[PDB]
Amino acid sequence: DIFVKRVDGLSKEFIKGVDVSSIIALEDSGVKFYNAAGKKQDIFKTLKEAGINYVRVRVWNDPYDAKGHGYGGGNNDLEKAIEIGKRATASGMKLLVDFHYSDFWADPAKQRPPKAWAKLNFEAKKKALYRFTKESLKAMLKEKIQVGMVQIGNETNGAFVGETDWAKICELLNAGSRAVRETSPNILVVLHFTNPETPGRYASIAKTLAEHKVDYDVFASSYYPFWHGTLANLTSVLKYVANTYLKKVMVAETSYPYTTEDGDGHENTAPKSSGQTLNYPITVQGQANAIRDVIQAVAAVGKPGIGVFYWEPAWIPVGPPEQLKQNEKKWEKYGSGWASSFAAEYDPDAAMWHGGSAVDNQALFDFNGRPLPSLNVFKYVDTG
Amino acid sequence: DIFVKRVDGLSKEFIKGVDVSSIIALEDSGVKFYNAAGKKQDIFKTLKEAGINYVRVRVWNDPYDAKGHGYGGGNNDLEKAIEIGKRATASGMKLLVDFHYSDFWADPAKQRPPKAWAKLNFEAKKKALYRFTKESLKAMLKEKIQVGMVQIGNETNGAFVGETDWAKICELLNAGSRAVRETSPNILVVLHFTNPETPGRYASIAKTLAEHKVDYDVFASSYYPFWHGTLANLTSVLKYVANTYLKKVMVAETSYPYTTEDGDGHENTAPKSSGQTLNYPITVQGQANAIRDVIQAVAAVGKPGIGVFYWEPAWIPVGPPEQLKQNEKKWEKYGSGWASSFAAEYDPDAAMWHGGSAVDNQALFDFNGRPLPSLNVFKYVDTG
Amino acid sequence: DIFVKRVDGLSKEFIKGVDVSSIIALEDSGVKFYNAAGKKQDIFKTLKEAGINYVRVRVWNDPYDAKGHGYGGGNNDLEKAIEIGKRATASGMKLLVDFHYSDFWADPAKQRPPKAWAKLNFEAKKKALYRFTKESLKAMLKEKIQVGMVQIGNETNGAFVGETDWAKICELLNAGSRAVRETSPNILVVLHFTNPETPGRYASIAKTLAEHKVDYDVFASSYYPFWHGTLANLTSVLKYVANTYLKKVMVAETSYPYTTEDGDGHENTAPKSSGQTLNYPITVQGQANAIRDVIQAVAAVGKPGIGVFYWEPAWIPVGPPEQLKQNEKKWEKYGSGWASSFAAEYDPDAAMWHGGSAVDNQALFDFNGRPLPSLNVFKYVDTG
Ligand SMILES: [Ca+2]
Ligand SMILES: [Ca+2]
Ligand SMILES: [Ca+2]
String of DSSP letters for A113-153: PPSTTTT--HHHHHHHHHHHHHHHHHHHHHTT--EEEEEE-
Q: C276 CA to middle of ligand 1, Å? A: 24
Burial (CB count within 10 angstroms: exposed 0-12, middle 13-18, buried 19+), residue B213: exposed
CA torsion sign for B8, B9, B10, B14 is negative
Strand partners, A188: A149
Which chain A residues in 252-271 lie under 8 Å from chain B, judged by CB atoms? 260-261, 271
Position B146, amino acid? Q
Residue B55 · residue B84 · CB < 8 Å: yes
Position B192, amino acid? H
Residue C191 · residue C216 · CB < 8 Å: yes
- DSSP letter for each residue of B135-165: HHHHHHHHTT--EEEEEESSS-SS-BTTB--
- What are the C-alpha distances in Å from C53 to residues B64, C33, C46? 68, 19, 12
Position A193, amino acid? F
Residues 6+ apart with CB under 8 A from A245: A206, A209, A210, A219
- What are the C-alpha distances in Å from C155 to residues A267, A276, B136, C105? 37, 32, 54, 10
> What are the strands, taking DSSP E only, across chain C?
15-19, 54-59, 94-99, 147-152, 188-193, 218-222, 248-254, 305-311
Residues 6+ apart with CB under 8 A from A185: none
How many DSSP H helices and E strands does chain A contain?
Answer: 11, 8
Query: Distance between CA atoms of A321 and B110, rounded to whole angstroms?
Result: 29
Task: Give the distance between the most distant pair of CA atoms in chain C.
Answer: 57
B122-142 and B166-183 helices, crossing angle to 10°: 30
Cβ-based contacts of B352 with chain A (< 8 Å)? 260, 271, 273
- Give residue C308's region: left, alpha or beta (phi > 0; psi -120 to 50): beta
By C-alpha distance, the chain A residue nearest C275 is A109
Cβ-based contacts of A274 with chain C (< 8 Å)? none
**Which among A261, A273, A277 is the nearest to B349, CB-wise?**
A273
> Can you tell me whether residue C94 is helix, strand or coil?
strand
Task: Give the distance between the most distant pair of CA atoms in chain A.
Answer: 57
Q: Which residues, by Cβ under 5 Å, contact ligand 2, an ion?
A: B 262, 264, 266, 268, 360
Q: A338 CA to middle of ligand 1, Å? A: 9
CA torsion angle C352 C357 C363 C365 (round to 10): -170
Q: Are strands B54-59 and C15-19 parallel, antiparallel or unpaired?
A: unpaired
Burial (CB count within 10 angstroms: exposed 0-12, middle 13-18, buried 19+), residue A76: buried
Name the binding residues of B for Ca(2+): 262, 264, 266, 268, 357, 360
Q: What angle do CA A83, A85, A88 make, to 5 degrees?
A: 110
Q: What angle do CA C193, C195, C199 make, to 5 degrees?
A: 110
Size of interface A-B (CB pairs under 8 A): 18
Residue C47 · residue C93 · CB < 8 Å: yes
- Among A318, A262, A333, A338, CA closest to A21: A338
- What is the number of alpha carbons within 13 Å of residue A71 lying toward its C-beta? 26
Compute φ and ψ for A58, nearest 5 degrees.
-90, 145
- What are the C-alpha distances in Å from A227 to residues A40, B279, C154? 35, 31, 36
Cβ-based contacts of A261 with chain B (< 8 Å)? 351
Strand partners, B248: B218
Query: Distance between CA atoms of A377 and A311, rounded to whole angstroms?
Result: 15
Query: Distance between CA atoms of A200 and A270, rounded to whole angstroms?
Result: 27
Cβ count near C16 (within 10 Å): 24
- DSSP letter for each residue of B203-218: HHHHHHHHHTT---SE
Query: Distance between CA atoms of A315 and A367, rounded to whole angstroms?
Result: 9
Nearest ligand atom owner, CA of C262? 3
Q: Which residues, by Cβ under 5 Å, contact ligand 3, an ion?
A: C 262, 264, 266, 268, 357, 360
Residue B74 · residue B335 · CB < 8 Å: yes
Q: Are strands B188-193 and B147-152 parallel, antiparallel or unpaired?
A: parallel
**Cβ pair A351:C277 closer than 8 A:** no
CB of C282 within 8 Å of any CB in chain A? Answer: yes
Query: Distance between CA atoms of B243 and C342, rounded to whole angstroms?
Result: 50
Query: Distance between CA atoms of A261 and B113, rounded to whole angstroms?
Result: 23
Residue A254 · residue A224 · CB < 8 Å: yes
Residue A82 · residue A42 · CB < 8 Å: no
Strand partners, C253: C222
Distance, first Cα to last Cα, chain A: 13
CB of C353 within 8 Å of any CB in chain B? Answer: yes
Compute φ and ψ for A38, nearest 5 degrees.
90, 20
- DSSP letter for each residue of C33-53: -B-TTS-B--HHHHHHHTT--
Cβ-based contacts of A351 with chain C (< 8 Å)? 260-261
Strand partners, C360: none
Classify domain A15-380 by CATH number: 3.20.20.80
Compute φ and ψ for B69, nearest 5 degrees.
-80, 130
- Give residue B101's region: left, alpha or beta (phi > 0; psi -120 to 50): left
Position A108, amino acid? P
> Can you tell me whether residue C272 is helix, strand or coil?
coil
Mutate to test the interface with A, among C3, C231, C269, C273 (most CBs of A within 10 A): C273
H or E segment to which residue A220 belongs = strand A218-222
Residue B270 · residue B362 · CB < 8 Å: yes
By C-alpha distance, the chain B residue nearest C349 is B273
Compute φ and ψ for C378, nearest 5 degrees.
-70, -25
What is the gyration radius of the CA atoms in chain A, in angstroms? 19
Mutate to test the interface with C, among A164, A165, A349, A354 (most CBs of C within 10 A): A349
- Among C55, C56, C32, CA closest to C42: C32
- Give residue A73's region: left, alpha or beta (phi > 0; psi -120 to 50): left
Cβ-based contacts of B349 with chain A (< 8 Å)? 271, 273
- Among B20, B3, B24, CA closest to B330: B24
- What are the C-alpha distances in Å from C334 to residues A166, C36, C58, C106, C343? 51, 27, 17, 20, 13
- DSSP letter for each residue of B5-59: ---TT--TT-EEEEE-TTHHHHHHTT---B-SSSSB--HHHHHHHHT--EEEEEE
Helices (H), A212-367: 231-245, 284-301, 324-334, 348-352
- Among C267, C277, C199, CA closest to C237: C199
CB of B348 within 8 Å of any CB in chain A? Answer: yes
- What is the number of alpha carbons within 13 Å of residue C2 lying toward its C-beta? 25
- Among B355, B327, B330, B329, CA closest to B341: B355
- What are the C-alpha distances in Å from B194 to residues A312, B191, B255, C116? 37, 10, 14, 38
Query: Distance between CA atoms of C285 and C5, rounded to whole angstroms?
Result: 11
Q: Are strands B54-59 and A305-311 parallel, antiparallel or unpaired?
A: unpaired
Burial (CB count within 10 angstroms: exposed 0-12, middle 13-18, buried 19+), residue A322: exposed
Query: Distance between CA atoms of B375 and B368, rounded to whole angstroms?
Result: 15
Cβ count near C327 (within 10 Å): 24
| DSSP designation for A253 | E
What is the gyration radius of the CA atoms in chain B, in angstroms? 19
Mutate to test the interface with A, among B110, B157, B345 (most CBs of A within 10 A): B345
**Cβ pair B278:C348 closer than 8 A:** yes
Residue A44 · residue A94 · CB < 8 Å: no
Compute φ and ψ for B370, nearest 5 degrees.
-90, 125
Classify domain B15-383 by CATH number: 3.20.20.80
Query: Distance between CA atoms of C104 and C60, rounded to whole angstroms?
Result: 6
Nearest ligand atom owner, CA of A324? 1
CA B335 remoteness from chain centre: 17
Nearest ligand atom owner, CA of A263? 1
Position C348, amino acid? P
Touching B (3+ Cβ pairs <8 A), the chains are: A, C
> What are the strands, taking DSSP E only, across A43-86?
54-59
By C-alpha distance, the chain C residue nearest A162 is C279
Active site residue A211: no
Query: Distance between CA atoms of A278 and A299, rounded to whole angstroms?
Result: 22
**Cβ pair B277:C109 closer than 8 A:** yes
H or E segment to which residue A219 belongs = strand A218-222
By C-alpha distance, the chain B residue nearest C341 is B260
C122-141 and C78-90 helices, crossing angle to 10°: 30
Q: C246 CA to middle of ligand 1, Å? A: 57
- Among C102, C167, C127, CA closest to C339: C102
Query: Distance between CA atoms of A170 and A152, rounded to whole angstroms?
Result: 11
CB of A66 within 8 Å of any CB in chain C? Answer: no
By C-alpha distance, the chain B residue nearest A268 is B352
Indicate the domain borders of chain B: 15-383
Compute φ and ψ for A18, nearest 5 degrees.
-140, 140
Q: What angle do CA C134, C135, C138 make, to 5 degrees?
A: 85
Strand partners, B59: B99
Compute φ and ψ for C183, nearest 5 degrees.
-75, -50
H or E segment to which residue C328 belongs = helix C324-334
**Which among A260, A279, A281 is the nearest to B351, CB-wise?**
A260
Cβ count near B328 (within 10 Å): 20
Q: B79 CA to middle of ligand 2, Å? A: 26
- What are the C-alpha distances in Å from A31 to residues A301, A357, A369? 39, 13, 8
Position A43, amino acid? I
Mutate to test the interface with C, among B273, B274, B293, B361 (most CBs of C within 10 A): B273
CA torsion sign for C126, C128, C129, C133 is positive
Query: Distance between CA atoms of C240 and B143, rounded to whole angstroms?
Result: 70
Compute φ and ψ for B75, nearest 5 degrees.
45, 55
Position B376, amino acid? N
Cβ count near C141 (within 10 Å): 15
Position B33, amino acid? F
> What are the strands, taking DSSP E only, across chain B?
15-19, 54-59, 94-99, 147-152, 188-193, 218-222, 248-253, 305-311
Burial (CB count within 10 angstroms: exposed 0-12, middle 13-18, buried 19+), residue C66: exposed
**Cβ pair B278:C351 closer than 8 A:** no
Residue A105 · residue A61 · CB < 8 Å: no
- What is the number of alpha carbons within 13 Å of residue B186 lying toward its C-beta? 5
CA B261 remoteness from chain centre: 23
- Among A190, A259, A202, A207, CA closest to A229: A202
Q: Are strands C248-254 and C218-222 parallel, antiparallel or unpaired?
A: parallel
Answer yes or no: is A264 a known binding residue: yes
* Cis before C271? omega within 30: yes
**Cβ pair C278:A109 closer than 8 A:** yes
**Cβ pair B272:C352 closer than 8 A:** yes
Compute φ and ψ for C349, nearest 5 degrees.
-55, -25
What is the gyration radius of the CA atoms in chain C, in angstroms? 19
Size of interface B-C (CB pairs under 8 A): 18
Query: Distance between CA atoms of C363 and A337, rounded to whole angstroms?
Result: 32
Which chain B residues in 159-178 lie under 8 Å from chain A, judged by CB atoms? 164
* Cis before A271? omega within 30: yes
Residues of B annotated as part of the active site: 155, 253
Query: Distance between CA atoms of C195 and B22, rounded to whole angstroms?
Result: 41
Position B284, amino acid? V
CB of A278 within 8 Å of any CB in chain B? Answer: yes
> Can you tell me whether residue A328 is helix, strand or coil?
helix
Cβ-based contacts of A271 with chain B (< 8 Å)? 348-349, 352
